[PDB]
Amino acid sequence: IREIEQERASFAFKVVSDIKDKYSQNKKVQGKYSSYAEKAPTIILNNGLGATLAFFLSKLEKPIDDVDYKSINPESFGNAENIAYAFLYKHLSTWLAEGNGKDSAFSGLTNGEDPLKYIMEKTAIDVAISTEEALSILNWIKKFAKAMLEEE
């Protein structure tokens, strides 16, 4: 009886604490991350999950169809907006592709494939379930970001 809600909460707490600790000095980075987190579900519901991920990648000045989440470093960007976008993309894609971990209750809907490349050549039902999971995890992430992270 291991509810996925516990995994969602643990992963969201871990990622928000990670960004808080790594960028405790950069208040503007925290504000940008919080704003992007609480605005992402609207973008996903409007234009879809793949469009949202491609929008994040474009804001990262990175090419699409040739970039996965494992090969991006969120801290390797000078701009605060790029920092926050990279962190949000990494967190969302990590939850979608691996979950809280291999040994955890939730291991991610995608086995290990990049969520964008997964969305490119999968059925509508799979991308719908992925969108639902992304909505839930983004809700938890926004909750925790509003909890700890400072507001821009």
Partner: protein, 336 residues
């Protein structure tokens, strides 16, 4: 010389590219705009999915506007039957209906989050611009607030010195230190008036006898609070959404483009000296052009006189206050 990509699933990107190349005929504007958003890559190595970069796939701005308006016009019969049913719904209640043309450009819903970063309120089924009833009610309430503050500023400030002191203390708490600077300008009067109308409605009982001249009629504070309602009492005037008349869409375009060119953007955001070494960052956004005619309707639940007063207030607000976005630049203004 531009590379177009589509982050939608496979076997659908081909149809999206056919729609954007005008090879096929799409009929829903919101569908092509939102669910089939293209990512355009120019000489710069970045797939910017913004209207400024989206328009690069067309010959010019005129071609983009023509394509958008043709897609909008392809659903004219369905929009006509929808507007007929909407008018029937209007006449079902004792609703007063008035038509108003757009004196200047109008844009409602510009602040909505989207891939383009500059959205527009389009009806989901038919893809036509419209004004939500919430926006009309809010603009009418704020016009009433502004009228009350301009006319009865000192009076309400004196009557509610406790409330104005509470607001000043709150502002000092949030707005930096500002221990007692808190200028008693018109904005503070508007804020305390809104606070009275929102959380302190009952204390507004004494003020209810006041009257303010709007247009040719006179409206009481009690009339306004009855119209809009409180946390404990529901409003009596139903504000319906506004939709353009289907006839005008056949001849003149119902959607055009507008540009914002923020020079000195780092000066505004980061703090660099303005100077002139601040190459602009143009951003385009959709907006319904001036002259487009909209139909508004306000219904009553208790008294038709309140409906007439609300109609007059809304007409005055649309003539002076303006609805939509960027109202400080004269956008979203209506004329008789």
């Amino acid at each position: 010389n531009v590379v177009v990509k589509y982050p939608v699933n496979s076997e659908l990107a081909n149809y999206a590219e056919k729609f954007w190349k005008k090879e096929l005929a799409i009929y829903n504007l919101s569908l092509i705009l939102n669910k089939m958003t293209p990512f355009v890559k120019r000489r710069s190595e970045s797939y910017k999915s913004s209207l400024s970069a989206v328009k690069e796939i067309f010959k010019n701005v005129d071609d983009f506007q023509n394509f958008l308006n043709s897609v909008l016009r392809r659903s004219l019969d369905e929009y006509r039957v929808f507007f007929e049913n909407y008018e029937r719904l209007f006449n079902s209640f004792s609703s007063k209906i008035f038509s108003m043309r757009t004196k200047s450009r109008l844009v409602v819903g510009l602040g909505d989050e989207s891939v383009y970063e500059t959205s527009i309120r389009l009806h989901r089924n038919y893809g036509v611009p419209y004004i939500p009833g919430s926006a009309l009610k809010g603009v009418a309430k704020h016009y009433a607030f502004s009228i009350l503050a301009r006319e009865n500023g000192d009076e309400i400030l004196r009557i509610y010195e406790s409330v104005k002191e509470d607001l000043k203390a709150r502002i000092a708490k949030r707005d930096k230190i500002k221990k007692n600077d808190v200028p008693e300008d018109y904005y503070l009067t508007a804020a305390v008036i809104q606070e009275l109308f929102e959380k302190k409605f009952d204390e507004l009982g004494a003020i209810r006898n006041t009257r303010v001249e709007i247009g040719d009629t006179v409206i009481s504070v009690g009339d306004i609070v009855k119209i809009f309602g409180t946390q404990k009492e529901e409003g009596s005037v139903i504000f319906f959404d506004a939709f353009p008349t289907p006839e005008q869409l056949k001849d003149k375009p119902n959607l055009e483009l507008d540009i914002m060119n923020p020079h000195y953007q780092p000066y505004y955001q980061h703090g660099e000296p303005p100077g002139d070494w601040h190459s602009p960052n143009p951003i385009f956004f959709l907006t319904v052009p001036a002259g487009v005619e909209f139909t508004f309707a306000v219904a009553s639940r208790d008294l038709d006189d309140l409906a007439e007063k609300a109609e007059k207030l809304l007409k005055e607000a649309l003539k002076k206050f303006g609805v939509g976005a960027k109202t400080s630049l004269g956008y979203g203004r209506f004329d008789a």
